[PDB]
Amino acid sequence: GSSGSSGLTVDVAGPAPWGFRISGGRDFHTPIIVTKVTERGKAEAADLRPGDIIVAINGQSAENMLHAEAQSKIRQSASPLRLQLDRSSGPSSG
Description:
By secondary structure, the protein is an alpha+beta fold. Helix content is 14%, strand content 27%. The chain has two helices and six strands. Residues 8-88 form the PDZ domain.
């Protein structure tokens, strides 16, 4: 059976740091996207990659999260740290 859902979650390890960065945010009126992802770190360990659009944080929408909000919330996020990533890619060839 097929399914949509659209959006996957991740379980980062802790405690902090995580080993990943972010960008945008309600402040920049942009989605919380990962900029860097410390290798052999915690994030990577789970399944966090650079570019992943953080939909929520531990189950809390991140659509309207300030660069300082997501940063704080996250920082103040026990382990594991659940993060809903919005993965909507399509197949292409040429």
